[PDB]
């Protein structure tokens, strides 16, 4: 009692905040009958058949969404898994001879006037001696005029050269789990009214994350994870005009679309072993790909979003939406992916309204590009090979990345326009209720012991 003596305790529940490297855990799904994936999960280990979560209590731990290292750890794994899966296949440099292109007039519609082009050029055959005359169909977004049947040129044999995508693999996303190594724990906040930089007095611990799809989109999140109750508004600091507003939906909105044009890929040879799959002969009419959304759902989802959003900007304000006002070609237009073909739809029929304080469907035209430059860098691209038949995609609009304009002193004319930028807000919307903690077990405490000799 009157004597107080130190005592060393091992393995007490004490943790600190730190950073480390997490690893794969993907569902097996047999995986023997697989057509490979660019996000190769064969290197990843099999996952737990049933993850177990332990509910904590009495503990309130502060979180943070905008200063999380998990996001920056993920963005250097998708890129690294992308560069690794484009190395062992064709590396076509000899495709930028002076193309001699002309127009196409095979039963076209005035909406798709121009666009497709009949290009014709010379290639080196498998023998290093002879040359062959080939022809192809090239979209207007992949050829530029030179020397102003005028000669054209691929937009890319001016700054870089690109490797045609490996034709066996597919761009299908698959769920992936991120699990921490031994000696660390994954804290997860289970409160339904989380708002970003705020403590969760319900935090539990989990073996590791739930399956999260590495989808890629812009200004409209697709196939995301919804939220309970009502739509949620998150931001870094919502008083500024240079910070995004990551809206999260409650009731999903279905969007679906196709490419109504038959396409027959044809293969030609450019060397020993290597092949080049170019498009030729569109069998049928010529129409433009367009995406349909249901008006009866958007007409109420925008209303719910504005009702929730009017909290931070006063009650007597006129919220007004608008379309993107300019920028790059990846930010100002929807840029999703659908079965190996990259659409660039033009969303200006949605962000069109004005809201005061007191069956029909919407169609969005689209364009197709083949010389993609995702993971924005300088010195790479990827010729996406043409695919046969007509593809259809049905997708789930659970999100929005609106940004403000403001700046015009104090008034009530708040306008919101969609906007992207860094492709890091598509993963800060799925890894927001997680943090990684390092356990420090050794501890010291006073008690009534002596350690008699």
């Amino acid at each position: 009692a009157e004597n107080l003596w130190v005592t060393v305790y091992y393995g007490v529940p004490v943790w600190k905040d730190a950073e480390t490297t997490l690893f794969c855990a993907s569902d097996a799904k047999a995986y023997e009958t697989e057509k490979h994936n660019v996000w190769a999960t064969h290197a990843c280990v099999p996952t737990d058949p049933n993850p177990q979560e332990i509910h904590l209590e009495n503990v309130t731990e502060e979180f943070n969404m905008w200063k999380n290292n998990m996001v920056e750890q993920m963005h250097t794994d998708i890129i690294s898994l992308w560069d690794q899966s484009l190395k062992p296949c064709v590396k076509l440099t000899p495709l930028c001879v002076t193309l001699q292109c002309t127009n196409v007039t095979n039963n076209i519609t005035d909406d798709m006037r121009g666009e497709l082009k009949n290009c014709s050029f010379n290639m080196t055959t498998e023998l290093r001696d002879k040359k062959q005359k080939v022809y192809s169909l090239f979209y207007r977004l992949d050829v530029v005029q030179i020397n102003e049947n005028k000669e054209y040129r691929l937009i890319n044999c001016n700054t870089s050269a690109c490797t045609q995508a490996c034709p066996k693999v597919s761009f299908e996303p698959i769920p992936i789990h991120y699990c921490a190594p031994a000696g660390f724990a994954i804290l997860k906040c289970k409160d339904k009214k989380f708002n970003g930089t705020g403590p969760c007095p319900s935090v539990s611990t989990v073996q590791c994350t739930h399956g999260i799809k590495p989808v890629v989109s812009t200004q409209l999140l697709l196939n995301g994870s919804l939220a309970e109750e009502e739509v949620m508004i998150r931001s870094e600091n919502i008083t500024n005009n240079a910070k995004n507003i990551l809206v999260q939906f409650n009731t999903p909105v279905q969007i679906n679309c196709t490419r109504p044009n038959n396409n027959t890929r044809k293969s030609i040879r450019i060397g020993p072993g290597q092949a080049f799959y170019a498009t030729g002969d569109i069998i049928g009419d010529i129409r433009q790909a367009h995406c349909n959304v249901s008006k009866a759902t958007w007409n109420e989802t925008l209303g719910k979003v504005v009702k929730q959003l009017r909290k931070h900007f006063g009650n007597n304000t006129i919220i007004r939406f608008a379309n993107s006002s300019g920028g790059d070609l990846e930010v100002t237009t929807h840029s999703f992916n659908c079965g190996g073909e990259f659409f660039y739809c033009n969303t200006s029929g949605l962000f069109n309204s004005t809201w005061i304080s007191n069956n029909d469907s919407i169609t969005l035209p689209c364009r197709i590009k083949q010389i993609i430059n995702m993971w924005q860098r300088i010195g790479q691209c990827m010729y996406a090979p043409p695919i046969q038949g007509v593809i259809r995609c049905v997708s789930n609009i659970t999100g929005l990345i609106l940004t403000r304009d403001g700046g015009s002193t104090n008034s009530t004319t708040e306008t919101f326009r969609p906007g992207g930028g860094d492709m890091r807000d598509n993963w800060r919307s799925e890894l927001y209720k997680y943090k990684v903690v390092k356990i420090e077990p050794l501890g010291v405490a006073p008690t009534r012991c002596k350690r008699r000799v």
């Binding site: 009692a1 005592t7 091992y10 393995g11 943790w15 332990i54 501890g443 405490a445 002596k450």
Partner: protein
């Protein structure tokens, strides 16, 4: 029972000193991506565990979980009642309170252990 990793992290210190085994049994569980990434952590974990074990062994300790020791409380680190410490706070609060008095303690313990070793060694001589 109330098992699981970090299960009693919210429980009081009185009942927390019963699951020391659970929180210490799994400290050592076990050229493309998912390659050297695993191997960069599977060595760091081993090094951390070995360092903790060596630190525990330097003092007069390594029985394991609970270990008695000399060098009494300085009475200035915490002017609190014993039942105050052991029945109302949690381990996280205790760490926050004594996060920054430990550095001198980590040397006091080892010097006491060395003194005890010398006493035993020179006592085992005259007999």
């Amino acid at each position: 029972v109330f098992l699981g990793f970090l299960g009693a992290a919210g429980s009081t210190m009185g009942a927390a000193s019963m699951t020391l085994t659970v929180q210490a049994r799994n400290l050592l569980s076990g050229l493309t991506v998912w390659g050297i990434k695993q191997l960069q952590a599977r060595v760091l974990a081993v090094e951390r565990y070995l360092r903790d074990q060596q630190l525990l062994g330097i003092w007069g300790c390594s029985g394991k979980l609970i270990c008695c020791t000399n060098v009494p409380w300085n009475s200035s680190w915490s002017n609190r009642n014993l039942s105050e410490i052991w029945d109302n706070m949690t381990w996280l609060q205790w760490d926050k309170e004594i996060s920054n008095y430990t550095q001198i303690i980590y040397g006091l313990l080892e010097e006491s252990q060395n003194q005890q070793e010398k006493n035993e060694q020179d006592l085992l001589a005259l007999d």
